[PDB]
């Protein structure tokens, strides 16, 4: 009962922890991309308005 | 001049019946309930423990 309970809580806890850890990491990636993309769109408008 | 034995044996059997029966009885009973109540008590509380 005791050791069990200890490992169970400790575990599901930690699992949650890394889970969110990744989640935030990835979210940070989608941000990273959509940032880079945003940059790209910037470059595009630049050229367009320019030669225009 | 009188037989006189069984009298002393009998009175000593009274007071000593009391002292002896008294002395041993409580310990042996507390040993009984100590034992049954022992394996028992542990098992039960430990059942609450494991289950819970």
mmCIF file of N, CA, C and O in Angstrom:
data_model
loop_
_atom_site.group_PDB
_atom_site.id
_atom_site.type_symbol
_atom_site.label_atom_id
_atom_site.label_comp_id
_atom_site.label_asym_id
_atom_site.label_seq_id
_atom_site.Cartn_x
_atom_site.Cartn_y
_atom_site.Cartn_z
ATOM 1 N N UNK A 1 0.827 -1.197 0.000
ATOM 2 C CA UNK A 1 0.000 0.000 0.000
ATOM 3 C C UNK A 1 0.863 1.250 0.000
ATOM 4 O O UNK A 1 0.729 2.118 -0.870
ATOM 5 N N UNK A 2 1.778 1.345 0.963
ATOM 6 C CA UNK A 2 2.513 2.587 1.153
ATOM 7 C C UNK A 2 3.444 2.873 -0.012
ATOM 8 O O UNK A 2 3.300 3.889 -0.705
ATOM 9 N N UNK A 3 4.396 1.974 -0.254
ATOM 10 C CA UNK A 3 5.375 2.217 -1.307
ATOM 11 C C UNK A 3 4.667 2.439 -2.626
ATOM 12 O O UNK A 3 4.965 3.379 -3.373
ATOM 13 N N UNK A 4 3.687 1.579 -2.891
ATOM 14 C CA UNK A 4 2.817 1.738 -4.040
ATOM 15 C C UNK A 4 2.345 3.172 -4.160
ATOM 16 O O UNK A 4 2.727 3.886 -5.090
ATOM 17 N N UNK A 5 1.538 3.615 -3.197
ATOM 18 C CA UNK A 5 0.978 4.957 -3.241
ATOM 19 C C UNK A 5 2.050 5.982 -3.563
ATOM 20 O O UNK A 5 1.893 6.808 -4.473
ATOM 21 N N UNK A 6 3.176 5.895 -2.852
ATOM 22 C CA UNK A 6 4.279 6.815 -3.082
ATOM 23 C C UNK A 6 4.627 6.880 -4.559
ATOM 24 O O UNK A 6 4.566 7.945 -5.187
ATOM 25 N N UNK A 7 4.944 5.728 -5.141
ATOM 26 C CA UNK A 7 5.348 5.705 -6.537
ATOM 27 C C UNK A 7 4.233 6.192 -7.444
ATOM 28 O O UNK A 7 4.491 6.828 -8.468
ATOM 29 N N UNK A 8 2.984 5.893 -7.095
ATOM 30 C CA UNK A 8 1.874 6.228 -7.977
ATOM 31 C C UNK A 8 1.726 7.731 -8.098
ATOM 32 O O UNK A 8 1.773 8.299 -9.199
ATOM 33 N N UNK A 9 1.553 8.394 -6.959
ATOM 34 C CA UNK A 9 1.468 9.843 -6.968
ATOM 35 C C UNK A 9 2.701 10.443 -7.621
ATOM 36 O O UNK A 9 2.602 11.178 -8.614
ATOM 37 N N UNK A 10 3.878 10.104 -7.087
ATOM 38 C CA UNK A 10 5.128 10.637 -7.614
ATOM 39 C C UNK A 10 5.157 10.532 -9.126
ATOM 40 O O UNK A 10 5.441 11.508 -9.830
ATOM 41 N N UNK A 11 4.827 9.353 -9.634
ATOM 42 C CA UNK A 11 4.814 9.114 -11.065
ATOM 43 C C UNK A 11 3.854 10.054 -11.771
ATOM 44 O O UNK A 11 4.281 11.008 -12.427
ATOM 45 N N UNK A 12 2.546 9.824 -11.604
ATOM 46 C CA UNK A 12 1.555 10.542 -12.401
ATOM 47 C C UNK A 12 1.819 12.030 -12.370
ATOM 48 O O UNK A 12 1.653 12.737 -13.373
ATOM 49 N N UNK A 13 2.260 12.508 -11.209
ATOM 50 C CA UNK A 13 2.859 13.826 -11.116
ATOM 51 C C UNK A 13 3.896 14.034 -12.206
ATOM 52 O O UNK A 13 3.683 14.809 -13.143
ATOM 53 N N UNK A 14 5.024 13.328 -12.107
ATOM 54 C CA UNK A 14 6.139 13.583 -13.014
ATOM 55 C C UNK A 14 5.707 13.492 -14.471
ATOM 56 O O UNK A 14 6.085 14.327 -15.301
ATOM 57 N N UNK A 15 4.915 12.472 -14.791
ATOM 58 C CA UNK A 15 4.390 12.316 -16.140
ATOM 59 C C UNK A 15 3.701 13.582 -16.593
ATOM 60 O O UNK A 15 3.998 14.124 -17.663
ATOM 61 N N UNK A 16 2.769 14.067 -15.777
ATOM 62 C CA UNK A 16 2.185 15.368 -16.050
ATOM 63 C C UNK A 16 3.269 16.396 -16.319
ATOM 64 O O UNK A 16 3.182 17.176 -17.271
ATOM 65 N N UNK A 17 4.329 16.364 -15.513
ATOM 66 C CA UNK A 17 5.334 17.412 -15.576
ATOM 67 C C UNK A 17 6.012 17.444 -16.930
ATOM 68 O O UNK A 17 5.976 18.458 -17.629
ATOM 69 N N UNK A 18 6.639 16.340 -17.318
ATOM 70 C CA UNK A 18 7.271 16.298 -18.624
ATOM 71 C C UNK A 18 6.253 16.565 -19.713
ATOM 72 O O UNK A 18 6.551 17.222 -20.710
ATOM 73 N N UNK A 19 5.036 16.057 -19.528
ATOM 74 C CA UNK A 19 3.989 16.265 -20.516
ATOM 75 C C UNK A 19 3.836 17.740 -20.820
ATOM 76 O O UNK A 19 4.001 18.180 -21.964
ATOM 77 N N UNK A 20 3.568 18.528 -19.788
ATOM 78 C CA UNK A 20 3.467 19.963 -19.968
ATOM 79 C C UNK A 20 4.777 20.532 -20.477
ATOM 80 O O UNK A 20 4.787 21.448 -21.300
ATOM 81 N N UNK A 21 5.894 20.003 -19.984
ATOM 82 C CA UNK A 21 7.200 20.492 -20.406
ATOM 83 C C UNK A 21 7.285 20.484 -21.921
ATOM 84 O O UNK A 21 7.497 21.516 -22.566
ATOM 85 N N UNK A 22 7.071 19.310 -22.504
ATOM 86 C CA UNK A 22 6.998 19.180 -23.949
ATOM 87 C C UNK A 22 5.987 20.158 -24.508
ATOM 88 O O UNK A 22 6.312 20.983 -25.359
ATOM 89 N N UNK A 23 4.754 20.098 -24.004
ATOM 90 C CA UNK A 23 3.666 20.902 -24.557
ATOM 91 C C UNK A 23 4.108 22.342 -24.740
ATOM 92 O O UNK A 23 3.933 22.943 -25.805
ATOM 93 N N UNK A 24 4.707 22.904 -23.697
ATOM 94 C CA UNK A 24 5.202 24.268 -23.753
ATOM 95 C C UNK A 24 6.344 24.381 -24.745
ATOM 96 O O UNK A 24 6.475 25.387 -25.447
ATOM 97 N N UNK A 25 7.187 23.354 -24.815
ATOM 98 C CA UNK A 25 8.294 23.378 -25.764
ATOM 99 C C UNK A 25 7.776 23.467 -27.192
ATOM 100 O O UNK A 25 8.184 24.329 -27.975
ATOM 101 N N UNK A 26 6.874 22.557 -27.544
ATOM 102 C CA UNK A 26 6.261 22.558 -28.858
ATOM 103 C C UNK A 26 5.582 23.881 -29.133
ATOM 104 O O UNK A 26 5.864 24.539 -30.136
ATOM 105 N N UNK A 27 4.678 24.286 -28.242
ATOM 106 C CA UNK A 27 4.020 25.573 -28.396
ATOM 107 C C UNK A 27 5.042 26.641 -28.721
ATOM 108 O O UNK A 27 4.855 27.457 -29.631
ATOM 109 N N UNK A 28 6.173 26.591 -28.024
ATOM 110 C CA UNK A 28 7.278 27.480 -28.325
ATOM 111 C C UNK A 28 7.756 27.284 -29.754
ATOM 112 O O UNK A 28 8.228 28.226 -30.394
ATOM 113 N N UNK A 29 7.655 26.061 -30.273
ATOM 114 C CA UNK A 29 8.046 25.852 -31.661
ATOM 115 C C UNK A 29 7.047 26.489 -32.616
ATOM 116 O O UNK A 29 7.432 27.263 -33.492
ATOM 117 N N UNK A 30 5.758 26.165 -32.472
ATOM 118 C CA UNK A 30 4.732 26.777 -33.313
ATOM 119 C C UNK A 30 4.892 28.285 -33.324
ATOM 120 O O UNK A 30 4.745 28.943 -34.360
ATOM 121 N N UNK A 31 5.211 28.838 -32.162
ATOM 122 C CA UNK A 31 5.600 30.234 -32.089
ATOM 123 C C UNK A 31 6.827 30.502 -32.943
ATOM 124 O O UNK A 31 6.862 31.463 -33.710
ATOM 125 N N UNK A 32 7.847 29.656 -32.820
ATOM 126 C CA UNK A 32 9.103 29.902 -33.513
ATOM 127 C C UNK A 32 8.883 29.963 -35.014
ATOM 128 O O UNK A 32 9.293 30.914 -35.686
ATOM 129 N N UNK A 33 8.240 28.932 -35.550
ATOM 130 C CA UNK A 33 7.820 28.935 -36.940
ATOM 131 C C UNK A 33 7.039 30.196 -37.249
ATOM 132 O O UNK A 33 7.557 31.114 -37.886
ATOM 133 N N UNK A 34 5.813 30.294 -36.722
ATOM 134 C CA UNK A 34 4.911 31.373 -37.117
ATOM 135 C C UNK A 34 5.613 32.716 -37.036
ATOM 136 O O UNK A 34 5.273 33.657 -37.760
ATOM 137 N N UNK A 35 6.604 32.811 -36.158
ATOM 138 C CA UNK A 35 7.522 33.934 -36.178
ATOM 139 C C UNK A 35 8.291 33.977 -37.485
ATOM 140 O O UNK A 35 8.203 34.950 -38.236
ATOM 141 N N UNK A 36 9.040 32.917 -37.779
ATOM 142 C CA UNK A 36 9.832 32.884 -39.002
ATOM 143 C C UNK A 36 8.963 33.172 -40.214
ATOM 144 O O UNK A 36 9.321 33.969 -41.084
ATOM 145 N N UNK A 37 7.812 32.512 -40.284
ATOM 146 C CA UNK A 37 6.836 32.793 -41.322
ATOM 147 C C UNK A 37 6.523 34.273 -41.371
ATOM 148 O O UNK A 37 6.630 34.911 -42.421
ATOM 149 N N UNK A 38 6.134 34.831 -40.228
ATOM 150 C CA UNK A 38 5.843 36.251 -40.162
ATOM 151 C C UNK A 38 6.957 37.052 -40.801
ATOM 152 O O UNK A 38 6.717 37.912 -41.656
ATOM 153 N N UNK A 39 8.194 36.738 -40.426
ATOM 154 C CA UNK A 39 9.353 37.354 -41.043
ATOM 155 C C UNK A 39 9.292 37.232 -42.553
ATOM 156 O O UNK A 39 9.501 38.206 -43.282
ATOM 157 N N UNK A 40 8.997 36.033 -43.042
ATOM 158 C CA UNK A 40 8.930 35.832 -44.478
ATOM 159 C C UNK A 40 7.930 36.786 -45.106
ATOM 160 O O UNK A 40 8.271 37.552 -46.014
ATOM 161 N N UNK A 41 6.690 36.766 -44.615
ATOM 162 C CA UNK A 41 5.659 37.655 -45.138
ATOM 163 C C UNK A 41 6.149 39.088 -45.158
ATOM 164 O O UNK A 41 5.925 39.829 -46.125
ATOM 165 N N UNK A 42 6.841 39.487 -44.096
ATOM 166 C CA UNK A 42 7.471 40.796 -44.073
ATOM 167 C C UNK A 42 8.340 40.992 -45.307
ATOM 168 O O UNK A 42 8.142 41.935 -46.085
ATOM 169 N N UNK A 43 9.283 40.074 -45.521
ATOM 170 C CA UNK A 43 10.173 40.173 -46.671
ATOM 171 C C UNK A 43 9.382 40.331 -47.959
ATOM 172 O O UNK A 43 9.733 41.130 -48.842
ATOM 173 N N UNK A 44 8.287 39.587 -48.069
ATOM 174 C CA UNK A 44 7.484 39.628 -49.279
ATOM 175 C C UNK A 44 6.921 41.019 -49.510
ATOM 176 O O UNK A 44 7.203 41.658 -50.534
ATOM 177 N N UNK A 45 6.133 41.512 -48.550
ATOM 178 C CA UNK A 45 5.574 42.853 -48.661
ATOM 179 C C UNK A 45 6.640 43.849 -49.043
ATOM 180 O O UNK A 45 6.417 44.730 -49.885
ATOM 181 N N UNK A 46 7.801 43.727 -48.408
ATOM 182 C CA UNK A 46 8.951 44.553 -48.714
ATOM 183 C C UNK A 46 9.159 44.600 -50.216
ATOM 184 O O UNK A 46 8.914 45.634 -50.854
ATOM 185 N N UNK A 47 9.563 43.466 -50.787
ATOM 186 C CA UNK A 47 9.879 43.446 -52.211
ATOM 187 C C UNK A 47 8.733 44.013 -53.042
ATOM 188 O O UNK A 47 8.943 44.845 -53.936
ATOM 189 N N UNK A 48 7.508 43.579 -52.740
ATOM 190 C CA UNK A 48 6.342 43.946 -53.544
ATOM 191 C C UNK A 48 6.185 45.455 -53.595
ATOM 192 O O UNK A 48 6.328 46.086 -54.648
ATOM 193 N N UNK A 49 5.877 46.044 -52.441
ATOM 194 C CA UNK A 49 5.719 47.488 -52.340
ATOM 195 C C UNK A 49 6.877 48.195 -53.024
ATOM 196 O O UNK A 49 6.698 49.226 -53.684
ATOM 197 N N UNK A 50 8.081 47.651 -52.869
ATOM 198 C CA UNK A 50 9.282 48.234 -53.449
ATOM 199 C C UNK A 50 9.246 48.349 -54.967
ATOM 200 O O UNK A 50 9.101 49.451 -55.510
ATOM 201 N N UNK A 51 9.377 47.215 -55.659
ATOM 202 C CA UNK A 51 9.413 47.260 -57.116
ATOM 203 C C UNK A 51 8.154 47.910 -57.649
ATOM 204 O O UNK A 51 8.164 48.539 -58.711
ATOM 205 N N UNK A 52 7.051 47.756 -56.919
ATOM 206 C CA UNK A 52 5.865 48.551 -57.192
ATOM 207 C C UNK A 52 6.226 50.024 -57.281
ATOM 208 O O UNK A 52 5.988 50.678 -58.300
ATOM 209 N N UNK B 1 -4.526 -33.368 67.945
ATOM 210 C CA UNK B 1 -5.329 -34.524 68.328
ATOM 211 C C UNK B 1 -6.474 -34.722 67.348
ATOM 212 O O UNK B 1 -7.077 -35.789 67.280
ATOM 213 N N UNK B 2 -6.753 -33.681 66.580
ATOM 214 C CA UNK B 2 -7.808 -33.680 65.585
ATOM 215 C C UNK B 2 -7.184 -33.807 64.204
ATOM 216 O O UNK B 2 -6.022 -33.444 64.004
ATOM 217 N N UNK B 3 -7.948 -34.379 63.271
ATOM 218 C CA UNK B 3 -7.498 -34.590 61.899
ATOM 219 C C UNK B 3 -6.781 -33.358 61.355
ATOM 220 O O UNK B 3 -5.579 -33.412 61.073
ATOM 221 N N UNK B 4 -7.519 -32.261 61.184
ATOM 222 C CA UNK B 4 -6.960 -30.913 61.095
ATOM 223 C C UNK B 4 -6.246 -30.565 59.788
ATOM 224 O O UNK B 4 -5.918 -29.395 59.572
ATOM 225 N N UNK B 5 -5.998 -31.539 58.908
ATOM 226 C CA UNK B 5 -5.313 -31.213 57.657
ATOM 227 C C UNK B 5 -6.180 -30.433 56.673
ATOM 228 O O UNK B 5 -5.805 -29.323 56.249
ATOM 229 N N UNK B 6 -7.332 -31.002 56.312
ATOM 230 C CA UNK B 6 -8.107 -30.513 55.173
ATOM 231 C C UNK B 6 -8.574 -29.091 55.423
ATOM 232 O O UNK B 6 -8.885 -28.346 54.489
ATOM 233 N N UNK B 7 -8.649 -28.702 56.695
ATOM 234 C CA UNK B 7 -9.007 -27.328 57.021
ATOM 235 C C UNK B 7 -7.978 -26.356 56.465
ATOM 236 O O UNK B 7 -8.307 -25.476 55.658
ATOM 237 N N UNK B 8 -6.718 -26.512 56.878
ATOM 238 C CA UNK B 8 -5.672 -25.634 56.380
ATOM 239 C C UNK B 8 -5.533 -25.707 54.877
ATOM 240 O O UNK B 8 -5.435 -24.680 54.193
ATOM 241 N N UNK B 9 -5.546 -26.928 54.335
ATOM 242 C CA UNK B 9 -5.475 -27.065 52.886
ATOM 243 C C UNK B 9 -6.605 -26.305 52.206
ATOM 244 O O UNK B 9 -6.420 -25.720 51.133
ATOM 245 N N UNK B 10 -7.779 -26.278 52.838
ATOM 246 C CA UNK B 10 -8.952 -25.678 52.217
ATOM 247 C C UNK B 10 -8.891 -24.158 52.266
ATOM 248 O O UNK B 10 -9.191 -23.480 51.276
ATOM 249 N N UNK B 11 -8.524 -23.599 53.420
ATOM 250 C CA UNK B 11 -8.437 -22.145 53.532
ATOM 251 C C UNK B 11 -7.341 -21.615 52.619
ATOM 252 O O UNK B 11 -7.543 -20.654 51.861
ATOM 253 N N UNK B 12 -6.161 -22.239 52.680
ATOM 254 C CA UNK B 12 -5.105 -21.900 51.737
ATOM 255 C C UNK B 12 -5.599 -22.034 50.306
ATOM 256 O O UNK B 12 -5.213 -21.256 49.429
ATOM 257 N N UNK B 13 -6.471 -23.013 50.056
ATOM 258 C CA UNK B 13 -7.080 -23.145 48.742
ATOM 259 C C UNK B 13 -8.002 -21.979 48.418
ATOM 260 O O UNK B 13 -8.187 -21.658 47.241
ATOM 261 N N UNK B 14 -8.581 -21.342 49.432
ATOM 262 C CA UNK B 14 -9.433 -20.185 49.182
ATOM 263 C C UNK B 14 -8.580 -18.970 48.851
ATOM 264 O O UNK B 14 -8.590 -18.471 47.719
ATOM 265 N N UNK B 15 -7.816 -18.487 49.837
ATOM 266 C CA UNK B 15 -7.020 -17.281 49.625
ATOM 267 C C UNK B 15 -6.071 -17.450 48.448
ATOM 268 O O UNK B 15 -5.941 -16.557 47.602
ATOM 269 N N UNK B 16 -5.413 -18.600 48.373
ATOM 270 C CA UNK B 16 -4.515 -18.885 47.270
ATOM 271 C C UNK B 16 -5.253 -19.113 45.962
ATOM 272 O O UNK B 16 -4.725 -18.757 44.908
ATOM 273 N N UNK B 17 -6.436 -19.722 45.999
ATOM 274 C CA UNK B 17 -7.247 -19.787 44.790
ATOM 275 C C UNK B 17 -7.437 -18.390 44.228
ATOM 276 O O UNK B 17 -7.274 -18.158 43.024
ATOM 277 N N UNK B 18 -7.749 -17.439 45.108
ATOM 278 C CA UNK B 18 -7.910 -16.057 44.689
ATOM 279 C C UNK B 18 -6.614 -15.505 44.111
ATOM 280 O O UNK B 18 -6.569 -15.091 42.949
ATOM 281 N N UNK B 19 -5.546 -15.504 44.911
ATOM 282 C CA UNK B 19 -4.295 -14.897 44.467
ATOM 283 C C UNK B 19 -3.832 -15.498 43.150
ATOM 284 O O UNK B 19 -3.488 -14.774 42.213
ATOM 285 N N UNK B 20 -3.817 -16.824 43.066
ATOM 286 C CA UNK B 20 -3.290 -17.494 41.886
ATOM 287 C C UNK B 20 -4.181 -17.269 40.678
ATOM 288 O O UNK B 20 -3.728 -16.742 39.654
ATOM 289 N N UNK B 21 -5.453 -17.665 40.780
ATOM 290 C CA UNK B 21 -6.374 -17.469 39.669
ATOM 291 C C UNK B 21 -6.309 -16.038 39.174
ATOM 292 O O UNK B 21 -6.198 -15.788 37.967
ATOM 293 N N UNK B 22 -6.327 -15.090 40.106
ATOM 294 C CA UNK B 22 -6.182 -13.680 39.777
ATOM 295 C C UNK B 22 -4.906 -13.428 38.989
ATOM 296 O O UNK B 22 -4.937 -12.881 37.882
ATOM 297 N N UNK B 23 -3.770 -13.831 39.554
ATOM 298 C CA UNK B 23 -2.475 -13.517 38.963
ATOM 299 C C UNK B 23 -2.398 -13.997 37.523
ATOM 300 O O UNK B 23 -2.108 -13.216 36.609
ATOM 301 N N UNK B 24 -2.680 -15.276 37.297
ATOM 302 C CA UNK B 24 -2.439 -15.865 35.986
ATOM 303 C C UNK B 24 -3.518 -15.444 35.001
ATOM 304 O O UNK B 24 -3.235 -15.125 33.840
ATOM 305 N N UNK B 25 -4.771 -15.434 35.454
ATOM 306 C CA UNK B 25 -5.900 -15.254 34.545
ATOM 307 C C UNK B 25 -5.781 -14.007 33.686
ATOM 308 O O UNK B 25 -5.865 -14.118 32.449
ATOM 309 N N UNK B 26 -5.588 -12.818 34.248
ATOM 310 C CA UNK B 26 -5.559 -11.604 33.434
ATOM 311 C C UNK B 26 -4.453 -11.670 32.403
ATOM 312 O O UNK B 26 -4.665 -11.348 31.224
ATOM 313 N N UNK B 27 -3.257 -12.093 32.809
ATOM 314 C CA UNK B 27 -2.166 -12.190 31.830
ATOM 315 C C UNK B 27 -2.504 -13.112 30.677
ATOM 316 O O UNK B 27 -2.293 -12.749 29.514
ATOM 317 N N UNK B 28 -3.053 -14.291 30.969
ATOM 318 C CA UNK B 28 -3.320 -15.259 29.914
ATOM 319 C C UNK B 28 -4.424 -14.777 28.988
ATOM 320 O O UNK B 28 -4.381 -15.024 27.780
ATOM 321 N N UNK B 29 -5.433 -14.101 29.537
ATOM 322 C CA UNK B 29 -6.478 -13.553 28.685
ATOM 323 C C UNK B 29 -5.919 -12.455 27.793
ATOM 324 O O UNK B 29 -6.121 -12.458 26.572
ATOM 325 N N UNK B 30 -5.196 -11.508 28.394
ATOM 326 C CA UNK B 30 -4.539 -10.463 27.619
ATOM 327 C C UNK B 30 -3.583 -11.052 26.602
ATOM 328 O O UNK B 30 -3.232 -10.389 25.624
ATOM 329 N N UNK B 31 -3.133 -12.281 26.832
ATOM 330 C CA UNK B 31 -2.326 -12.988 25.850
ATOM 331 C C UNK B 31 -3.206 -13.522 24.733
ATOM 332 O O UNK B 31 -2.821 -13.503 23.563
ATOM 333 N N UNK B 32 -4.381 -14.032 25.093
ATOM 334 C CA UNK B 32 -5.346 -14.503 24.106
ATOM 335 C C UNK B 32 -5.723 -13.379 23.161
ATOM 336 O O UNK B 32 -5.370 -13.380 21.972
ATOM 337 N N UNK B 33 -6.465 -12.407 23.685
ATOM 338 C CA UNK B 33 -6.806 -11.223 22.919
ATOM 339 C C UNK B 33 -5.573 -10.541 22.372
ATOM 340 O O UNK B 33 -5.645 -9.896 21.327
ATOM 341 N N UNK B 34 -4.449 -10.641 23.066
ATOM 342 C CA UNK B 34 -3.215 -10.128 22.499
ATOM 343 C C UNK B 34 -2.905 -10.809 21.174
ATOM 344 O O UNK B 34 -2.494 -10.149 20.215
ATOM 345 N N UNK B 35 -3.133 -12.119 21.093
ATOM 346 C CA UNK B 35 -2.731 -12.887 19.919
ATOM 347 C C UNK B 35 -3.760 -12.768 18.805
ATOM 348 O O UNK B 35 -3.472 -12.244 17.715
ATOM 349 N N UNK B 36 -4.967 -13.281 19.062
ATOM 350 C CA UNK B 36 -6.057 -13.115 18.114
ATOM 351 C C UNK B 36 -6.177 -11.656 17.708
ATOM 352 O O UNK B 36 -6.118 -11.321 16.520
ATOM 353 N N UNK B 37 -6.284 -10.767 18.697
ATOM 354 C CA UNK B 37 -6.332 -9.335 18.425
ATOM 355 C C UNK B 37 -5.057 -8.834 17.767
ATOM 356 O O UNK B 37 -5.033 -7.722 17.231
ATOM 357 N N UNK B 38 -3.987 -9.622 17.801
ATOM 358 C CA UNK B 38 -2.737 -9.163 17.212
ATOM 359 C C UNK B 38 -2.733 -9.394 15.709
ATOM 360 O O UNK B 38 -2.827 -8.442 14.918
ATOM 361 N N UNK B 39 -2.631 -10.664 15.299
ATOM 362 C CA UNK B 39 -2.710 -10.994 13.876
ATOM 363 C C UNK B 39 -3.918 -10.320 13.267
ATOM 364 O O UNK B 39 -3.862 -9.753 12.165
ATOM 365 N N UNK B 40 -5.030 -10.369 13.995
ATOM 366 C CA UNK B 40 -6.242 -9.674 13.595
ATOM 367 C C UNK B 40 -5.977 -8.194 13.366
ATOM 368 O O UNK B 40 -5.952 -7.725 12.222
ATOM 369 N N UNK B 41 -5.742 -7.454 14.453
ATOM 370 C CA UNK B 41 -5.655 -5.999 14.386
ATOM 371 C C UNK B 41 -4.754 -5.562 13.245
ATOM 372 O O UNK B 41 -5.139 -4.729 12.408
ATOM 373 N N UNK B 42 -3.557 -6.145 13.179
ATOM 374 C CA UNK B 42 -2.671 -5.845 12.073
ATOM 375 C C UNK B 42 -3.329 -6.092 10.733
ATOM 376 O O UNK B 42 -3.286 -5.239 9.844
ATOM 377 N N UNK B 43 -3.938 -7.266 10.566
ATOM 378 C CA UNK B 43 -4.536 -7.586 9.277
ATOM 379 C C UNK B 43 -5.583 -6.556 8.886
ATOM 380 O O UNK B 43 -5.599 -6.084 7.747
ATOM 381 N N UNK B 44 -6.448 -6.179 9.826
ATOM 382 C CA UNK B 44 -7.549 -5.276 9.512
ATOM 383 C C UNK B 44 -7.044 -3.887 9.165
ATOM 384 O O UNK B 44 -7.319 -3.361 8.079
ATOM 385 N N UNK B 45 -6.308 -3.275 10.090
ATOM 386 C CA UNK B 45 -5.780 -1.947 9.820
ATOM 387 C C UNK B 45 -4.988 -1.949 8.526
ATOM 388 O O UNK B 45 -5.049 -0.996 7.747
ATOM 389 N N UNK B 46 -4.266 -3.035 8.272
ATOM 390 C CA UNK B 46 -3.481 -3.149 7.056
ATOM 391 C C UNK B 46 -4.379 -3.323 5.844
ATOM 392 O O UNK B 46 -3.975 -3.057 4.709
ATOM 393 N N UNK B 47 -5.597 -3.810 6.064
ATOM 394 C CA UNK B 47 -6.547 -3.933 4.971
ATOM 395 C C UNK B 47 -7.076 -2.566 4.594
ATOM 396 O O UNK B 47 -7.071 -2.180 3.422
ATOM 397 N N UNK B 48 -7.534 -1.817 5.596
ATOM 398 C CA UNK B 48 -7.818 -0.406 5.389
ATOM 399 C C UNK B 48 -6.658 0.259 4.670
ATOM 400 O O UNK B 48 -6.849 1.025 3.720
ATOM 401 N N UNK B 49 -5.440 -0.071 5.089
ATOM 402 C CA UNK B 49 -4.249 0.538 4.518
ATOM 403 C C UNK B 49 -4.123 0.221 3.039
ATOM 404 O O UNK B 49 -4.047 1.125 2.203
ATOM 405 N N UNK B 50 -4.099 -1.062 2.701
ATOM 406 C CA UNK B 50 -3.905 -1.464 1.317
ATOM 407 C C UNK B 50 -5.027 -0.940 0.442
ATOM 408 O O UNK B 50 -4.789 -0.249 -0.555
ATOM 409 N N UNK B 51 -6.262 -1.260 0.815
ATOM 410 C CA UNK B 51 -7.421 -0.787 0.073
ATOM 411 C C UNK B 51 -7.341 0.711 -0.159
ATOM 412 O O UNK B 51 -7.194 1.178 -1.295
ATOM 413 N N UNK B 52 -7.394 1.472 0.931
ATOM 414 C CA UNK B 52 -7.374 2.922 0.838
ATOM 415 C C UNK B 52 -6.233 3.402 -0.039
ATOM 416 O O UNK B 52 -6.455 4.096 -1.039
#
